[PDB]
Amino acid sequence: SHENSNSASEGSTINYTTINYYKDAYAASAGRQDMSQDPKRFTDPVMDVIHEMAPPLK
Amino acid sequence: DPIADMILQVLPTAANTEASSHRLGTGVVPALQAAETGASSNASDKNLIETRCVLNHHSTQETAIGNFFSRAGLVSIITMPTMGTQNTDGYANWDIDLMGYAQLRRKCELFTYMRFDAEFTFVVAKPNGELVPQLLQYMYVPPGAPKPTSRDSFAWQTATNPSVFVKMTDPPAQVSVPFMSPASAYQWFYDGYPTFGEHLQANDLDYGQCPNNMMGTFSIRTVGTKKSPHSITLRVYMRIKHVRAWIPRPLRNQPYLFKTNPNYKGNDIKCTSTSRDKITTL
Amino acid sequence: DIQMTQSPASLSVSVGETVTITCRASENIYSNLAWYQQKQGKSPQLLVYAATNLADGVPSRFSGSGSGTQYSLKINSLQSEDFGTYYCQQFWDTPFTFGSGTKLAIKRADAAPTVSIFPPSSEQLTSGGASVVCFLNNFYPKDINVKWKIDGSERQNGVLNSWTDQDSKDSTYSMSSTLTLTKDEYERHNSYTCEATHKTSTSPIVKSFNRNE
Amino acid sequence: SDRVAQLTIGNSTITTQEAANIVIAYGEWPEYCPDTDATAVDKPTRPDVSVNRFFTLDTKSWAKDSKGWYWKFPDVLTEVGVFGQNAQFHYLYRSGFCVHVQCNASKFHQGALLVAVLPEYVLGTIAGGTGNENSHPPYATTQPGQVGAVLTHPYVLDAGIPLSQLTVCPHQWINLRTNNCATIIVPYMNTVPFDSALNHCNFGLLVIPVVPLDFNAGATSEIPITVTIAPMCAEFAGLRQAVKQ
Amino acid sequence: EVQLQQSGPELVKPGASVKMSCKTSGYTFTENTMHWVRQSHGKSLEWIGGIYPKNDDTKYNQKFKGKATLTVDKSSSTACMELRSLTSEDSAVYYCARGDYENYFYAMDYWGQGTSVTVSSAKTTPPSVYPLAPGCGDTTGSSVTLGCLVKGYFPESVTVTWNSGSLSSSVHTFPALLQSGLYTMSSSVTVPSSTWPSQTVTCSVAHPASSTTVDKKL
Amino acid sequence: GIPTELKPGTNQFLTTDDGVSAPILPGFHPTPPIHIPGEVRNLLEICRVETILEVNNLKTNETTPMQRLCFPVSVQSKTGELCAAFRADPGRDGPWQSTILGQLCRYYTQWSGSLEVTFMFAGSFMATGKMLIAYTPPGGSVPADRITAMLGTHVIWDFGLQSSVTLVVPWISNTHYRAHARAGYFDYYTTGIITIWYQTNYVVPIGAPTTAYIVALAAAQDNFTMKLCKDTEDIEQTANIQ
């Protein structure tokens, strides 16, 4: 059974291995989620980098 | 050329704590930060006090978006009784608007845009909890499809509409509804007047109403021409899977009043923090 | 639509006898039945709801019973103020339907009708018409057949009559006659006879008139 | 050297002396619509020197009993400049924004301002105080224009969300002890590639006086607050007639 | 304890519209449903539709869906209906009554007054009496009965008067009859042979609608 | 026909069970997604953002909730006074409910990892003074004196060009994880008591205001984890949602 690419995770896959007993791809299970994190755009959303040992204001 | 000016880090476990000693000197100040830059403090525990080598084996799988949304929740309760005023004809049309219950609504209001698939579960029971051998029919009405006016209407032939024949003695039926929104993701909060022309006071109901989240109606009926003597109460449970989220928002600390727009009570505004007597007592 | 048929259409009985009327629906309505009592020119009132419980202001003489499709309503003992039509109503299917009605009259003895045949006058001939009337009073029961014989032939259409309601003390009915015919077609024939076949006698009485009488 | 900044976009130049770093919203620089995500088949126009420039809005007044102010973008620029006329002549619109808030004071004054950027900031209503009636905010509050409106409840921000959790949004504090300016670069954030600017607001600004202004008698009692908004990478498609509202 | 009062009888033409009312008191109007039951000739009953007056809730009949609308004013305790495209077979009495608490079942105990509504395009005509006196010259038998006839009256009805109300037990009434869109009346009084030719009787019919009183000597 | 014996668990609907359901549309390819900034792939990125801590939560300022976001600091006659005192547990009802770290912590039962508390000084430029931010391990009440409170984790911060400072609460626990603390058998999972003292004085010249405000911020660290997800107590729905 060759499934098509009709799913909400197209282009950016968060799952690793799922089980799909039907033809469509959105009817499958959730799967093991991806461990990738990027907190730099939320915690330090500035242009110039601020070092830990260096003072933030000159 | 006559014109010149026309030319992700995989973190399966938590971060370990490295050992550190005391520091004595000038010029380096990891404690002093600047909160006026709109950024969080990058100071760690080893740069302030003396720490030791700690191997952290704690996993971060429970903190994922997929594991946080893979649990089902109650979104709608449809009551089709024999006596009453609302749905006593044998059929009930429920518009698809999953804002009626505040347990799963606060999760969806954490993010602005959310693209996901859903898994519906329909549990059938009597108002007193008993079960009878009764046949029930589901139907999905997208926008543009005719709505039924009776149980013996032409819309219940269901040529192109999805339909589930379930019984009250059967297990609840599970389907997988795909991403049906015409946009890239579901928009929980719509800002602006979507209509055209000059906006009046009588047309103020259209604020915060986006057509991308309107999936139509969900109609149920009793299979048969005669009326059934048993009352049917249906409960819908949605399980979110394959979820991508964007633009996180603050949660709501006020009780919900209406499902159309996030209104709040003006006279009674409950604070988020629990009050106490003094700031120096505990 | 669940239709209801009541039997009989009209039942006449005296005061002091049990009256049993039946209401029947095409489908099962699960003991959802009502009963009404409508008098002459009055609003109906609820007698017994759900075929087991009587409403307020209803005496204990009205007792209904029934299950499934076929139902019944027993009246014991009958009084003099319980006359009127009766209907039944279902609470199962939308729209709600009513019965055909059952009129309750008072049974009396046999009575002979009064023959009244009058020739037309000359005052109605100025407007271009003519009307010959024929009345009958003090007759029982209401079974009658109007027969007009002119030169051994019937005329259709144009023969229709009306009746009156039941009286209090006399408790009889009355007949009326209205015929529409012009003046130029009245003087072509001479034989005019008003006949009524009733169950009092095997042969109806014969009474006729002429032009110059 | 990090406190002195200069922003040169178009024919306008903003020069500050004491300011913090430039805050990029979610680490995304504003860019043009790519050919993969574009759904409109018509050719859009991209003016640079006539649109992408700093537009100074109206001047507010910061008092001791100030509650807060909010501006809806791009509702403040539908009638200002060539950007306002191109937004009315075109059906589709996509642009990033450069928000710059200027608030200067002396060294004897004190106070802090919280400048935040909230995408899809939907205004609610108090429902008359009882909550038994359904009321909606009018056109003067949802789209105030270039003037702006005043928040009647700065704690719940007329949406039911607390002010304490507002720093998860791209924000920048204005504390009068350290800095007098704040610059937030906001790209285009929507579920659609193009969207009409007249019927929909992409995001909104929120300037709330969390720390009140306190000063002794004899100092300057008038503290102005100015907002200079600059579009970045504007695209206009679907040329039509003149549509005001 | 509960009294339901309706509007007055109105005579309308075919093609126009009408609007009635049903004012009641003595109970909470917003918590009890209402129904409308019509009664056509002779004893047939039909069901117009139900109304649950909280904000708006109406259960229309499949036959009378487009010919009847139900509206409820929440300020004053009243229930008004409106009918469109009236015809000859829509001339019947209309009833209004209170239903059950939050239910369309549990049929009505207290009903209305039954305002009659007739639909006719006939012009109002003053009545003309018709004399009827015997006869062929031979009186038979011992009872010499007589009467009178009314032709050309609109609308219903007229009044009967025999010698200024002398005998009230022998005078009988009769309903109207349909003859080419006009109505007619009749009477039958059993009089013995002791009146004619000694005493003289007369019949007088008065019309309260058209204010026409014609006396005829028999 | 293969032989098959059914097991317990037949006709059971578990809300957390991940199964395969039947699709209702054949070959329904959805809308192709676009690039939207601010993608959240994990909830720990939200907990590391500093949110405003409400240390001034009292019963007097409930009518004016804008005063709960900061606590005052003025000139004192005697040295060594206590400014504010609160618990460092994000899972307790109190000051930590207003932060997004505490609100996401109430969706879970057990939590681990160190957290940071950031104090920002919003006074005048001519205002100088030193502050003591002490962290006390559990086992005792709030210290009455400054000499008793300096035995724990503390730092010395002076007002200057940097108007804010941070001092991380160290993860000092008997267990690897701890549940939310309440009055009873769950009070043993307490984090500690955060006290703020006056180090020397608060000095202002002539013309400067004698009362300033300090804004409190709180966030998590890189080793912060949570588990055993549940529903929070802050959400409430009594009658219905119309």
Residue numbers in the entry:
A (entry chain D): 12 to 69
B (entry chain A): 2 to 8, 23 to 297
C (entry chain E): 1 to 213
D (entry chain B): 10 to 254
E (entry chain F): 1 to 218
F (entry chain C): 1 to 242
From the paper:
Coxsackievirus A16 (CVA16), a member of the Enterovirus genus within the Picornaviridae family, is one of the major causative agents of hand, foot and mouth disease (HFMD) prevalent in infants and young children. Specifically, CVA16 utilizes cell surface heparan sulfate (HS) glycosaminoglycans as its attachment receptor, and human scavenger receptor B2 (SCARB2, also known as lysosomal integral membrane protein 2, LIMP-2) as its uncoating receptor. Cryo-EM studies show that 9B5 and 8C4 target distinct epitopes located at the 5-fold and 3-fold protrusions of CVA16 capsids, respectively, and exhibit differential binding preference to three forms of naturally occurring CVA16 particles.
From the same CVA16–9B5 dataset, we obtained three cryo-EM maps in distinct conformations namely C1, C2, and C3, at the resolution of 2.90, 3.35, and 3.80 Å and population distribution of 29.3%, 37.2%, and 33.5%, respectively. In all of the CVA16–9B5 maps, 9B5 Fab binds to the five-fold vertex, with each CVA16 protomer bound with a Fab. The CVA16–9B5 interaction interface covers a relatively small surface area (536.4 Å2) on each protomer, and the 9B5 heavy and light chains contribute 51.3% and 48.7% of the overall binding interactions, respectively. It appeared that despite 9B5 and SCARB2 bind to different regions of the viral capsid, the constant region of 9B5 clashes with the membrane proximal region of SCARB2 (bound to an adjacent protomer) in binding to CVA16 capsid.
